[PDB]
């Protein structure tokens, strides 16, 4: 039957489809970076990332209010990773930050590319986790 | 002297004999005597007891004591067929079946809370409405920022969706195809939700429908809001003490400990404590008095649920009387001819004082919590200006 | 069980309470009893046993044994169990169109963005002809056929809803 | 104070008498006292703004106390009226009697006093914009 | 359960087995009835219904 | 950082109550909280007006007047009685018809007495 | 000419949206008036079950 928890899983298939599109665009941006460019991939990345947090930050306050404690708990490892990159390591920046003024010197370029496949692997597993517990809460 | 069994008739001063009295057991004594063929003398008991064997002197009192010791020949009265009485007198078959029942106060209009205005829609709907509001506002923001035609950042998307839901129109509207699919489906959502709020509110205000919180003694055992209590002594007191079933042991550990004392001392004290506790006292008493007080004035009390046990009222004779067999067959004649049902409908229902519109304006109480949110939102808006004036 | 709520059956109270606890859990007992009668243990009218049996019944009644045995066989060996506001199940399909319409609009935002980034009289001449021929076709077929109105006027039976049509029909503007 | 039904001319207080609504109007009592406090704060801070205009912020803040006062009337008068209607409801409905509540000229004076300090709230803020642009 | 055939004036059933000596007692859902109480002795009701 | 002086603010709030509001709309967060809770206020108040008026007009349409004695025997909220003597009182006393025995059961036990003493007294009480 | 088509479509939806809310209020009121059987006097009155 349709319930509020089943709607909280329907509403996060729709927005995790945006979260994977943020990351397909994020692996192309660093691949096209190595081919060519700094100031544009400063600006094009910097606009993208703050939607990616708060959409996932929406999911934290949505499954908290839905009483889905396993689902809220599985968004916790991505959440506390996200608090670190904005409260303590968004290195100095001050336009938005983080995929900003600090490009080559090439040590963050390897750290971003390991992150960029780690985001896609979590989001593609979150998409089928959300699609399963949608079908779970609807049928049951 | 017990109602409706024997009541002294209104002008009993100018009357004499078997016609000073009226009631169920006066109309029953008439029926027993014309089927058994005798002439009778209605005689109210002395002590005022029903009958009990004294623990020290071993002497029966009440109506049982008059039949054992010779002062009476029959006791046509609400006298409960029990084990200790059957050993000394002889009962007939039960002319009335009854048991322990629940008396609550009759439910009322049930004054509103703060968030009573939310009640036409379930709380599971309102939670889905709030999270669909942020849902369509993020999707407006995703659609308008990436693949632009904007003027639709995250706070102009939250204001488009708030104004669309409140049916206040807009100042800006989306210009692209994909922003108009977001905007137009959220418009259709709002149209169904606001129309079903007004339609379900019109149903509530048209049809009053008062439900009782207690409809069983299981429902009393699963709560501590409503305090339930028997009389201080008697058979309803003794029932919950020695019970072993599942539920009446739960109801007994409640009543024996609870402060203030739920045990009233008189039936009229228990009825008044029902009427004067606005739905917080449920009185446990026999089902025959419960159906009678429900029919007296005021209409303030109600019987709920089934009975808790099964007992009966018998017509008693001394052990060895020659009335014992014909009165027993007289009761079974009166049962199957519908006489006993007819006498109960006369004295409980046809002589019942309680028997068995005009929509009123909405009071401020019904909608008062919308005023609290408004001034609570006016004061919250004056703080956000104060933070905006400091931060800039 | 086969009349959808349009039949009520008047029986004794103790079978009505027993069938209520036996699968399928279709039926329920409503109201109080219409009369008052009782079941007794009977003895041959001259027996030396009718008096100890009478004091046994009154002893078993006051110790809760008769109420214990009825809960055992009606309820404990049973097979069944034991808001006025509008629910989500009634307005669930407007949430499906909302989620379905938000997912459609993010799909359109893809094939706008791909079309914007990557980037006459002949097209509209081609489309306003094939829509005009098939307009003449589909209405030309429709007014010249006799499949407009499927109409039945049958009768029901109160026996597992046995259905017998007597006036089934299909109609058009010119044929019946 | 009673009249004409057991006409006791003794004006009883609310604490030394024991009706359930008389305890319900105790709950709606602090808000006309918070309102009268904010009118007296906003008034003595308006007169400072008339005798020392070298600091202009006296006029705008006294406008805020004139507006926080009137919002405390409305919550008080909603609480006051809703406390009456709740206790008119929780009574044994009998058609052989009648009930009748009314309001008097003290309820009217608290209602008109909303209009005057919200008007004093606006005029103190427009007076601030006259002083600040000068 | 027990009924009198008005032609023969004989009882068929459990009331029959008590009146004509075959049974000594009938522990059964037997309704306490006027026509039965004349020919057999019921106890107090073990079940009210 | 006006368009929202006191007379345009009285016109925003008037048009928001009537749900007719095209004009300037607030652009600051603090102006949009006051705008937003006043929008929710009128959504409840205007819906409560229509729903309570629909409750009135439905209940005023459910009203069935008396047109039978079975309507009197069911509705025990309009009182009914006869004259204190004569054929009409003795009709209900002797009647064995269901609806007429219910009416006599009501009339013989009714406080105060529904039985008038004169025909002019009974037309007076109506 | 654009305000005649705009004006009759405004009057169309004023009737259609009001008819939706009024027929839904008619449904929810009648579904709230429904009294189930709970007595034999409810059976004797309701001659439809
Ligand atoms: C313009 C748009 C309008 C904006 C209006 C916003 C207001 C509404 C926003 C959010 C809703 C807040 C409350 C949601 C409650 C979740 C309920 C749920 O579906 O899950 C169920 C659980 C279990 O219930 P229980 O057994 O614990 O209660 C038992 C109750 N008893 C004590 C009677 C026995 O309930 C829980 O606690 C779940 C765990 C914690 C959830 C509540 C915490 C709220 C956190 C963030 C939301 C922001 C709040 C701001 C105000
Ligand atoms: C998004 C921005 C725009 C919106 C602005 C929001 C501000 C105004 C909102 C709320 C403030 C007004 C009311 C305060 C709520 C607590 C008072 C209260 O009595 O609540 C009771 C509720 C349950 O109500 P009921 O219907 O079941 O009553 C049942 C009564 N019976 C038994 C008769 C049936 O239970 C509870 O406490 C529920 C938990 C209370 C949560 C409300 C938080 C209040 C705190 C601060 C207010 C803001 C100040 C602004 C500066
Ligand atoms: C000032 C804001 C309103 C304050 C919220 C009042 C909530 C409390 C009111 C009365 C107290 C009774 C609460 C008891 C009911 C359920 C318990 C609960 O957990 O209490 C929170 C629920 C959450 O809902 P639930 O039934 O799913 O929890 C099911 C939880 N279980 C399984 C335990 C039942 O009640 C809810 O908060 C649902 C109500 C959410 C109200 C927000 C919508 C108002 C404005 C809408 C327009 C703007 C949005 C669109 C633009
Ligand atoms: C009831 C429980 C649920 C409430 C959740 C509250 C927790 C906060 C977390 C998430 C809330 C929002 C949901 C996710 C939002 C993702 C989108 C986003 O985050 O967008 C990123 C913004 C971009 O900014 P932009 O508009 O200039 O880009 C446009 C440029 N242009 C202006 C030139 C056109 O970056 C920014 O800093 C945005 C600044 C603020 C970010 C939070 C949004 C405000 C809160 C909304 C929820 C409350 C609803 C009302 C009750
Ligand atoms: C229960 C479910 C239903 C209830 C919910 C109701 C709402 C339904 C959801 C969405 C409906 C959207 C409303 C329709 C209007 C949107 C169309 C539109 O205005 O989108 C704007 C875009 C951009 O405009 P532009 O200035 O760049 O174009 C001209 C370029 N220039 C000026 C440079 C030469 O235009 C374009 O994409 C043009 C291409 C549009 C292709 C798809 C539209 C369908 C076309 C024909 C079928 C008729 C639909 C009837 C329904
Ligand atoms: C967007 C468009 C909006 C515009 C709509 C305009 C409509 C009205 C707007 C505001 C009016 C609300 C304020 C009303 C004041 C509270 C009055 C009240 O609710 O309590 C009534 C009291 C007491 O009644 P009583 O026992 O003394 O008389 C009984 C006479 N007997 C004994 C013969 C039956 O009123 C009294 O008479 C006390 C003595 C006289 C003092 C009150 C006079 C108030 C008249 C005008 C000032 C209000 C503002 C301008 C209008
Ligand atoms: C029946 C019950 C409901 C009504 C009860 C009344 C309660 C009213 C509460 C608060 C409102 C305060 C009254 C308004 C007058 C004070 C302001 C004033 O006086 O100066 C300011 C105004 C200039 O306004 P604005 O340019 O910002 O307009 C916006 C246009 N934008 C944005 C293009 C610049 O100047 C002017 O209009 C000249 C003033 C016009 C003269 C008549 C207006 C009333 C003035 C004083 C009497 C106070 C009433 C007390 C009762
Ligand atoms: C039952 C209960 C009642 C139900 C209904 C009540 C509804 C009440 C809610 C109303 C708000 C909903 C719509 C939200 C959008 C308003 C905010 C806004 O309009 O924009 C906020 C700011 C300032 O606007 P602006 O300078 O960008 O606009 C430029 C144009 N000009 C220059 C003219 C100013 O934008 C920025 O600076 C962003 C920078 C950082 C943002 C901080 C994140 C926190 C935001 C939380 C949002 C909700 C607050 C709590 C409520
Ligand atoms: C929720 C209660 C307790 C207080 C919330 C108010 C404060 C904490 C929040 C509300 C949202 C935030 C806003 C952030 C953006 C704007 C824009 C800025 O130009 C000034 C301030 C202003 C208008 C807000 C200041 C207040 C703010 C930091
Ligand atoms: C955009 C996508 C990815 C988000 C979720 C898709 C939703 C909106 C779609 C998917 C297909 C639809 C299903 C259709 C069949 C059933 C049966 C119906 O009785 C209820 C809902 C249910 C169980 C589904 C609900 C979800 C549904 C309406
Ligand atoms: C479900 C899918 C097929 C429906 C979505 C419609 C999309 C595919 C098509 C319809 C044809 C295209 C339109 C063609 C005309 C204009 C003009 C052009 O300057 C840009 C895009 C724009 C505004 C349209 C955008 C949408 C478009 C790319
Ligand atoms: C900053 C200001 C304006 C907003 C909050 C303050 C005051 C004015 C208001 C707004 C809503 C009010 C509450 C409303 C509900 C209850 C229940 C009521 O039985 C008494 C008061 C009480 C407990 C509240 C008292 C305080 C109250 C909070
Ligand atoms: N009455 C009223 C009312 C007025 C405005 C908004 C809501 C209500 C209201 C609605 C409902 C309700 C409930 C179910 C279905 C439809 N409506 C209930 N209540 C209410 C009334 C008294 C006590 C508690 C709630 C209400 O106060
Ligand atoms: O034989 C008995 N028959 C009884 C009959 C009735 C009545 F219902 F009025 F007919 C009552 N009441 C019920 C409520 O309290 C007031 C009188 C008590 C009876 N008692 C004493 P109890 O059962 O020990 O309480 C008997 O002993
Ligand atoms: O033969 C009779 N014819 C009657 C005719 C009438 C009249 F209607 F006036 F014609 C009346 N009234 C009924 C109305 O109030 C005025 C007197 C009484 C009559 N009675 C006595 P009732 O019938 O016992 O009451 C008769 O006996
Ligand atoms: Na209606």
Author numbering:
A (entry chain E): 2 to 37, 56 to 159
B (entry chain D): 401 to 549, 569 to 775, 782 to 817
C (entry chain A): 694 to 775, 784 to 820, 833 to 889
D (entry chain C): 890 to 907, 919 to 1034
E (entry chain A): 450 to 498
F (entry chain C): 548, 569 to 693
G (entry chain A): 597 to 645
What is written in the article reporting this PDB entry?
Synaptic complexes of α-amino-3-hydroxy-5-methyl-4-isoxazolepropionic acid (AMPA) receptors (AMPARs) with auxiliary subunits mediate most excitatory neurotransmission and can be targeted to treat neuropsychiatric and neurological disorders, including epilepsy. Here we present cryogenic-electron microscopy structures of rat GluA2 AMPAR complexes with inhibitory mouse γ5 and potentiating human cornichon-2 (CNIH2) auxiliary subunits. The core of each complex is a Y-shaped tetrameric AMPAR with a three-layer domain organization. Auxiliary subunits are membrane proteins that associate with and regulate AMPAR trafficking, cellular localization, gating kinetics and pharmacology.
To gain insight into the structural mechanism of PMP inhibition in the presence of γ5 and CNIH2, we supplemented the purified protein with 100 µM ZK and 100 µM PMP and subjected it to cryo-EM. Data processing revealed two populations of particles. Reconstruction from the second population of particles revealed densities for two γ5 and two CNIH2 subunits around the GluA2 TMD, molecules of ZK bound to LBD clamshells, PMP at the extracellular collar and SPD in the channel selectivity filter. The resulting GluA2–γ5–CNIH2ZK-SPD-PMP structure is similar to GluA2–γ5ZK-PMP, except that the latter lacks two CNIH2 subunits and SPD. GluA2–γ5–CNIH2ZK-SPD-PMP showed apparent asymmetry of the intracellular portion of the channel pore, which has not been observed in AMPAR structures before. Cysteines C589 formed two pairs of disulfide bridges clearly detected in cryo-EM density, illustrating the twofold symmetry of the channel intracellular entrance. Crosslinking of C589 cysteines was not observed in the GluA2–γ5ZK-PMP structure or in the absence of PMP (GluA2–γ5–CNIH2ZK-SPD), indicating that CNIH2 and PMP together are the two factors that cause strong deviation of the AMPAR inner pore from the fourfold rotational symmetry, likely due to increased protein flexibility in this region. While CNIH2 is in close proximity to the selectivity filter-forming M2 and can influence M2 dynamics directly through a single lipid molecule that separates them, PMP is distal from the inner pore. Being in the ion channel extracellular collar, PMP can influence the selectivity filter dynamics allosterically, through the M1, M3 and M4 helices. Accordingly, increased selectivity filter dynamics can cause a reduction in PMP affinity to GluA2–γ5–CNIH2ZK-SPD-PMP.
